[model samples]
Target: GRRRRSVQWCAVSQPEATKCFQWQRNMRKVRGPPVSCIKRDSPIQCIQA
Candidate 1:
Protein backbone atom coordinates (compact mmCIF):
# COMPACT_ATOMS: atom_id res chain seq x y z
CA GLY A 1 0.00 0.00 0.00
CA ARG A 2 0.97 3.68 -0.58
CA ARG A 3 -0.18 7.10 0.61
CA ARG A 4 -0.24 10.55 -1.03
CA ARG A 5 -0.31 14.16 0.26
CA SER A 6 -0.56 17.68 -1.20
CA VAL A 7 -0.07 21.23 0.12
CA GLN A 8 -0.23 24.78 -1.33
CA TRP A 9 -0.34 28.47 -0.32
CA CYS A 10 -1.01 31.75 -2.21
CA ALA A 11 -1.98 35.41 -1.87
CA VAL A 12 -4.18 37.88 -3.81
CA SER A 13 -3.89 41.70 -3.93
CA GLN A 14 -4.05 44.75 -6.21
CA PRO A 15 -1.08 45.98 -8.32
CA GLU A 16 -0.38 49.02 -6.14
CA ALA A 17 -0.48 46.95 -2.96
CA THR A 18 2.33 44.70 -4.32
CA LYS A 19 4.90 47.46 -4.86
CA CYS A 20 7.07 46.25 -1.98
CA PHE A 21 7.02 42.75 -3.38
CA GLN A 22 8.37 43.94 -6.76
CA TRP A 23 11.08 46.03 -5.06
CA GLN A 24 12.37 43.05 -3.10
CA ARG A 25 12.56 40.88 -6.23
CA ASN A 26 14.59 43.44 -8.25
CA MET A 27 16.89 44.69 -5.45
CA ARG A 28 17.50 41.85 -3.09
CA LYS A 29 20.87 43.26 -1.92
CA VAL A 30 19.83 46.90 -1.64
CA ARG A 31 19.64 48.85 1.64
CA GLY A 32 18.35 52.24 2.84
CA PRO A 33 20.34 55.05 4.47
CA PRO A 34 20.32 55.76 8.21
CA VAL A 35 18.43 58.64 9.91
CA SER A 36 18.68 60.62 13.16
CA CYS A 37 16.38 62.57 15.50
CA ILE A 38 17.09 65.47 17.88
CA LYS A 39 15.21 67.91 20.12
CA ARG A 40 15.74 71.68 20.08
CA ASP A 41 14.28 74.37 22.33
CA SER A 42 12.69 77.67 21.29
CA PRO A 43 14.73 80.86 20.62
CA ILE A 44 14.22 82.10 24.16
CA GLN A 45 15.66 78.87 25.61
CA CYS A 46 18.67 78.78 23.25
CA ILE A 47 20.46 81.68 25.07
CA GLN A 48 20.05 79.90 28.42
CA ALA A 49 22.13 76.90 27.26
Candidate 2:
Protein backbone atom coordinates (compact mmCIF):
# COMPACT_ATOMS: atom_id res chain seq x y z
CA GLY A 1 0.00 0.00 0.00
CA ARG A 2 1.19 3.46 -0.86
CA ARG A 3 1.29 5.67 2.17
CA ARG A 4 2.52 8.84 0.56
CA ARG A 5 1.03 12.12 1.68
CA SER A 6 1.67 15.78 1.00
CA VAL A 7 1.26 19.22 2.52
CA GLN A 8 0.24 22.08 0.25
CA TRP A 9 1.65 25.61 0.21
CA CYS A 10 0.85 28.92 -1.48
CA ALA A 11 3.34 31.12 -3.33
CA VAL A 12 2.75 34.65 -4.54
CA SER A 13 6.25 35.34 -5.85
CA GLN A 14 8.44 33.56 -8.42
CA PRO A 15 11.43 33.35 -6.11
CA GLU A 16 9.39 31.63 -3.42
CA ALA A 17 7.90 29.31 -6.03
CA THR A 18 11.37 28.33 -7.23
CA LYS A 19 12.45 27.42 -3.72
CA CYS A 20 9.21 25.57 -3.17
CA PHE A 21 9.69 23.57 -6.35
CA GLN A 22 13.31 22.84 -5.52
CA TRP A 23 12.34 21.85 -2.03
CA GLN A 24 9.78 19.46 -3.41
CA ARG A 25 12.37 18.03 -5.78
CA ASN A 26 14.73 17.32 -2.92
CA MET A 27 11.94 15.80 -0.86
CA ARG A 28 11.07 13.57 -3.80
CA LYS A 29 14.71 12.49 -4.13
CA VAL A 30 14.53 11.30 -0.53
CA ARG A 31 11.17 9.51 -1.08
CA GLY A 32 9.36 11.96 1.11
CA PRO A 33 6.14 13.89 0.72
CA PRO A 34 6.81 16.51 -1.94
CA VAL A 35 4.66 19.53 -1.26
CA SER A 36 2.59 21.40 -3.81
CA CYS A 37 2.53 25.15 -4.47
CA ILE A 38 -0.42 27.32 -5.36
CA LYS A 39 0.54 30.27 -7.56
CA ARG A 40 -1.84 33.17 -7.63
CA ASP A 41 -1.75 36.91 -8.10
CA SER A 42 -1.83 39.14 -5.09
CA PRO A 43 -5.28 40.61 -4.97
CA ILE A 44 -4.15 42.08 -1.67
CA GLN A 45 -5.92 39.02 -0.27
CA CYS A 46 -2.89 36.80 -0.13
CA ILE A 47 -1.15 38.34 2.79
CA GLN A 48 -0.36 34.94 4.29
CA ALA A 49 1.43 33.92 1.12
Candidate 3:
Protein backbone atom coordinates (compact mmCIF):
# COMPACT_ATOMS: atom_id res chain seq x y z
CA GLY A 1 0.00 0.00 0.00
CA ARG A 2 1.26 3.49 -0.83
CA ARG A 3 1.28 6.01 2.03
CA ARG A 4 1.84 9.72 2.37
CA ARG A 5 4.43 11.07 4.78
CA SER A 6 6.18 14.36 5.51
CA VAL A 7 9.69 15.26 6.56
CA GLN A 8 10.47 18.59 8.18
CA TRP A 9 13.59 20.30 9.49
CA CYS A 10 14.50 23.61 11.08
CA ALA A 11 17.61 25.79 11.03
CA VAL A 12 17.88 28.64 13.53
CA SER A 13 19.97 31.06 11.49
CA GLN A 14 19.57 29.92 7.94
CA PRO A 15 17.34 27.34 6.36
CA GLU A 16 20.05 26.78 3.77
CA ALA A 17 22.45 25.91 6.56
CA THR A 18 20.20 23.11 7.69
CA LYS A 19 21.29 19.56 7.08
CA CYS A 20 17.98 18.45 5.64
CA PHE A 21 19.63 16.51 2.86
CA GLN A 22 21.79 14.58 5.32
CA TRP A 23 18.74 13.98 7.44
CA GLN A 24 16.95 12.51 4.47
CA ARG A 25 19.98 10.40 3.68
CA ASN A 26 19.89 9.00 7.19
CA MET A 27 16.20 8.31 6.80
CA ARG A 28 16.88 6.16 3.77
CA LYS A 29 19.74 4.45 5.59
CA VAL A 30 17.30 3.31 8.26
CA ARG A 31 14.77 2.02 5.72
CA GLY A 32 12.61 5.11 5.79
CA PRO A 33 10.35 6.18 2.93
CA PRO A 34 12.06 6.71 -0.37
CA VAL A 35 12.00 10.44 -1.08
CA SER A 36 12.58 12.47 -4.24
CA CYS A 37 13.94 15.96 -4.69
CA ILE A 38 12.86 16.47 -8.30
CA LYS A 39 9.74 18.54 -8.87
CA ARG A 40 8.33 16.58 -11.82
CA ASP A 41 6.91 13.07 -11.74
CA SER A 42 8.15 12.39 -8.26
CA PRO A 43 5.98 10.66 -5.68
CA ILE A 44 7.97 12.23 -2.84
CA GLN A 45 8.27 15.97 -3.00
CA CYS A 46 10.54 18.08 -0.83
CA ILE A 47 8.87 21.20 0.43
CA GLN A 48 10.08 24.19 2.39
CA ALA A 49 9.31 24.28 6.08
Candidate 4:
Protein backbone atom coordinates (compact mmCIF):
# COMPACT_ATOMS: atom_id res chain seq x y z
CA GLY A 1 0.00 0.00 0.00
CA ARG A 2 1.16 3.50 -0.82
CA ARG A 3 1.11 5.97 2.01
CA ARG A 4 1.57 9.73 2.05
CA ARG A 5 3.63 11.45 4.70
CA SER A 6 4.04 15.11 5.51
CA VAL A 7 7.44 16.60 6.28
CA GLN A 8 7.93 19.43 8.76
CA TRP A 9 11.08 21.38 8.06
CA CYS A 10 12.86 23.79 10.37
CA ALA A 11 16.35 25.05 11.23
CA VAL A 12 18.14 25.58 14.51
CA SER A 13 21.29 27.54 15.15
CA GLN A 14 24.28 26.28 17.12
CA PRO A 15 27.00 28.44 18.62
CA GLU A 16 29.70 28.55 15.96
CA ALA A 17 32.62 29.87 18.04
CA THR A 18 32.64 26.94 20.45
CA LYS A 19 31.79 24.35 17.82
CA CYS A 20 32.95 25.43 14.42
CA PHE A 21 31.63 23.33 11.53
CA GLN A 22 29.87 21.15 14.09
CA TRP A 23 26.51 21.63 12.46
CA GLN A 24 27.66 20.79 8.97
CA ARG A 25 29.93 17.94 10.02
CA ASN A 26 27.46 16.49 12.48
CA MET A 27 24.74 16.57 9.89
CA ARG A 28 26.98 14.79 7.45
CA LYS A 29 27.94 12.23 10.11
CA VAL A 30 24.30 11.45 10.94
CA ARG A 31 23.43 11.30 7.25
CA GLY A 32 20.79 13.98 7.62
CA PRO A 33 18.81 14.66 4.48
CA PRO A 34 20.95 16.44 1.92
CA VAL A 35 20.42 20.17 1.54
CA SER A 36 19.65 19.46 -2.08
CA CYS A 37 16.59 17.51 -1.02
CA ILE A 38 15.10 20.66 0.44
CA LYS A 39 16.38 23.20 -2.10
CA ARG A 40 15.71 20.90 -5.04
CA ASP A 41 18.77 21.35 -7.28
CA SER A 42 20.01 24.62 -5.86
CA PRO A 43 23.50 25.15 -4.46
CA ILE A 44 23.99 24.31 -0.80
CA GLN A 45 24.29 27.18 1.66
CA CYS A 46 25.86 27.01 5.12
CA ILE A 47 25.21 29.75 7.62
CA GLN A 48 27.43 30.62 10.57
CA ALA A 49 25.90 32.32 13.52
Candidate 5:
Protein backbone atom coordinates (compact mmCIF):
# COMPACT_ATOMS: atom_id res chain seq x y z
CA GLY A 1 0.00 0.00 0.00
CA ARG A 2 1.17 3.54 -0.65
CA ARG A 3 0.86 4.28 3.03
CA ARG A 4 3.30 1.46 3.81
CA ARG A 5 5.64 1.93 0.88
CA SER A 6 9.31 1.37 1.60
CA VAL A 7 11.32 4.03 -0.07
CA GLN A 8 13.98 6.50 0.94
CA TRP A 9 16.46 8.97 -0.43
CA CYS A 10 19.89 10.14 0.64
CA ALA A 11 22.20 12.92 -0.44
CA VAL A 12 25.12 11.14 -2.08
CA SER A 13 27.18 14.28 -2.00
CA GLN A 14 27.61 17.35 0.07
CA PRO A 15 25.77 19.58 -2.37
CA GLU A 16 27.05 22.64 -0.59
CA ALA A 17 30.68 21.60 -0.98
CA THR A 18 31.05 23.55 -4.21
CA LYS A 19 29.43 26.56 -2.74
CA CYS A 20 31.67 26.37 0.32
CA PHE A 21 34.76 26.06 -1.83
CA GLN A 22 33.78 29.07 -3.90
CA TRP A 23 33.08 31.02 -0.77
CA GLN A 24 36.46 30.08 0.65
CA ARG A 25 38.22 31.29 -2.48
CA ASN A 26 36.24 34.48 -2.48
CA MET A 27 36.98 35.08 1.17
CA ARG A 28 40.70 34.68 0.58
CA LYS A 29 40.76 37.80 -1.55
CA VAL A 30 41.70 41.07 0.13
CA ARG A 31 38.57 42.68 1.56
CA GLY A 32 36.51 39.79 0.23
CA PRO A 33 33.18 38.92 1.81
CA PRO A 34 32.26 35.94 3.97
CA VAL A 35 30.01 33.00 3.09
CA SER A 36 27.52 33.95 5.79
CA CYS A 37 27.26 37.41 4.32
CA ILE A 38 26.75 35.99 0.85
CA LYS A 39 24.02 33.72 2.16
CA ARG A 40 22.41 36.58 4.02
CA ASP A 41 22.55 38.99 1.10
CA SER A 42 21.36 36.54 -1.52
CA PRO A 43 18.00 34.90 -2.09
CA ILE A 44 17.49 31.44 -3.49
CA GLN A 45 16.22 32.68 -6.81
CA CYS A 46 16.44 29.29 -8.42
CA ILE A 47 16.99 25.71 -7.46
CA GLN A 48 19.22 23.52 -9.69
CA ALA A 49 19.58 26.45 -12.04
Candidate 6:
Protein backbone atom coordinates (compact mmCIF):
# COMPACT_ATOMS: atom_id res chain seq x y z
CA GLY A 1 0.00 0.00 0.00
CA ARG A 2 1.13 3.51 -0.72
CA ARG A 3 -0.51 6.47 1.00
CA ARG A 4 -4.13 6.64 2.08
CA ARG A 5 -6.33 9.65 2.86
CA SER A 6 -9.06 10.54 5.35
CA VAL A 7 -12.38 12.35 5.51
CA GLN A 8 -13.61 14.64 8.27
CA TRP A 9 -16.90 16.42 8.83
CA CYS A 10 -19.07 17.87 11.54
CA ALA A 11 -22.53 16.88 12.70
CA VAL A 12 -25.02 18.76 14.83
CA SER A 13 -28.22 16.80 15.28
CA GLN A 14 -28.90 13.24 16.29
CA PRO A 15 -29.69 12.13 12.75
CA GLU A 16 -26.83 14.07 11.34
CA ALA A 17 -24.36 12.46 13.68
CA THR A 18 -25.98 9.12 13.12
CA LYS A 19 -25.74 9.58 9.39
CA CYS A 20 -22.10 10.41 9.66
CA PHE A 21 -21.49 7.38 11.80
CA GLN A 22 -23.37 5.09 9.45
CA TRP A 23 -21.85 6.60 6.36
CA GLN A 24 -18.29 5.95 7.45
CA ARG A 25 -19.04 2.31 8.02
CA ASN A 26 -21.12 2.02 4.86
CA MET A 27 -18.33 3.50 2.81
CA ARG A 28 -15.94 0.96 4.27
CA LYS A 29 -18.32 -1.72 3.00
CA VAL A 30 -16.80 -0.99 -0.39
CA ARG A 31 -13.34 0.56 -0.15
CA GLY A 32 -12.77 4.03 1.16
CA PRO A 33 -10.42 6.27 3.06
CA PRO A 34 -10.42 6.84 6.81
CA VAL A 35 -13.50 8.75 7.94
CA SER A 36 -14.10 10.94 10.96
CA CYS A 37 -17.28 12.20 12.56
CA ILE A 38 -17.26 15.36 14.61
CA LYS A 39 -20.03 16.20 17.02
CA ARG A 40 -20.29 19.96 16.94
CA ASP A 41 -22.85 22.47 18.10
CA SER A 42 -22.50 24.68 15.11
CA PRO A 43 -20.94 24.53 11.66
CA ILE A 44 -19.29 27.91 12.22
CA GLN A 45 -17.04 26.59 14.97
CA CYS A 46 -16.39 23.35 13.16
CA ILE A 47 -14.45 24.97 10.34
CA GLN A 48 -11.36 23.74 12.15
CA ALA A 49 -10.18 21.62 9.31
Best by TM-score: 6
Residue 43 error, candidate 1, Å: 36
lDDT of 1 by residue, 1-49 (tens): 1321110112122232244345444455564432111122233222333
User: Residue 23 deviation, candidate 4, in Å?
Assistant: 1.3
What is the C-alpha lDDT profile of model 2 across 1-49, one tens digit per residue? 1332221333335466666567767876774875565343244324653
Off by over 4 Å in 4: 1-20, 31-49
RMSD of each: 20.3, 9.3, 11.0, 12.8, 10.7, 9.4
Task: Candidate 2: count the clashes.
Answer: 0
TM-score computed on alpha carbons, candidate 5: 0.28
Candidate 4 C-alpha lDDT tens digits along 7-46? 1112232242223344445677785753323211122323
What C-alpha lDDT values do all the predictions have?
Answer: 0.29, 0.50, 0.38, 0.33, 0.39, 0.50
The ten-residue window of minimal lDDT in model 5 covers 4-13
Q: What TM-score goes with each of the models?
A: 0.23, 0.36, 0.25, 0.23, 0.28, 0.38
Number of clashing residue pairs, candidate 1:
0
Off by over 4 Å in 6: 1-12, 30-35, 39-49
Candidates, ranked, TM-score: 6, 2, 5, 3, 4, 1
Candidate 3 residue-wise lDDT, 1-49, digit = tens: 1322222322223233233455556776684775443222223323334
lDDT for model 6, on a 0 to 1 scale? 0.50
**What number of clashing residue pairs does each candidate have, in the order they appear?**
0, 0, 0, 0, 0, 0
TM-score for candidate 3: 0.25
Which clashing pairs does model 6 show?
none
Worst 10 residues of 2 by lDDT: 1-10
Q: Residue 21 in candidate 3 has what lDDT?
A: 55
Which lDDT tens digits does candidate 5 get at residues 1-49?
2431211112123345445556667668744765542222223412332
Pairs of colliding residues, candidate 5: none
> How many backbone collisions does model 4 have?
0
